[PDB]
Amino acid sequence: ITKVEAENMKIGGTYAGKISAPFDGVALYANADYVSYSQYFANSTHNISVRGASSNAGTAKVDLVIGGVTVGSFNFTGKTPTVQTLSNITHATGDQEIKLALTSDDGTWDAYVDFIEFS
Ligand SMILES: [Ca+2]
Ligand SMILES: [Ca+2]
Numbered sequence: 001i002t003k004v005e006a007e008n009m010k011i012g013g014t015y016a017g018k019i020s021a022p023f024d025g026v027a028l029y030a031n032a033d034y035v036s037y038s039q040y041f042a043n044s045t046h047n048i049s050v051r052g053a054s055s056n057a058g059t060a061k062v063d064l065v066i067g068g069v070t071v072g073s074f075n076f077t078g079k080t081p082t083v084q085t086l087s088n089i090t091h092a093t094g095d096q097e098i099k100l101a102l103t104s105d106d107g108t109w110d111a112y113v114d115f116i117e118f119s
Contacts, residue, residue, distance in 0.1 A: 002039070006100070006113040009035040013102075022053050022081050025114040028062065034101035035113060041093045049085045050100065051114035052076040060111035065099040066091040074100075081114060 006026040007018050013033030019025055026035050052074060054060040059077040063070050064086065071091055074084040100113055 002118040003115055004037060004039075004098075004117075005115045006035045009037040011035055019112060022079065022112060023051070023114040025052075025112055027055075028100075028102045028111040028113065029105070031102050031105045033105075034099050036097055036099040036101075038095055039098045039118075040095050041091070044093050045088055045090045046118040047085060047087050048072075048089055049083050049117040049119075050074045051081055051083045053081040053112040053114075054078055055110035055112065056108075058109040060109045061102075061104045062111050062113060063099075063101045063103050064089075065097070065101055067096040076111065081112075 007024050011026055015029035016033035017027060019027045054076050057078055059075050062074045064072050071089050072086045076082055
């Protein structure tokens with residue numbers, strides 16, 4: 001397993017910033033808010049998990065982008081943190097940017113991101 005905390009990544013966008021509740025992590029508020037870091041991959045295919053939460057009862061959606069290509073998304077509904085998992089995602093090998101980004105914000109929720117895990 002490879003686990004990287006959101007709070008240790010590059011944080012970007014107009015509003016993105018760290019939070020301490022409901023976990024140590026990062027809040028994404030508006031479209032183009034993101035966290036990213038560079039990951040070396042020896043292998044092409046991983047199960048990918050992100051722990052996160054919504055700011056409210058709504059469903060926060062976070063895109064997963066690897067090497068600039070969107071490979072899936074994670075949905076977090078409600079304020080209680082959950083772990084969301086994409087199974088068997090194939091992506092580029094070598095050094096690749098990993099980004100968790102908002103693209104579907106509409107002023108009804110914010111997304112809280114705790115960590116990403118590759119297995
Ligand atoms: Ca928002
Ligand atoms: Ca964290």
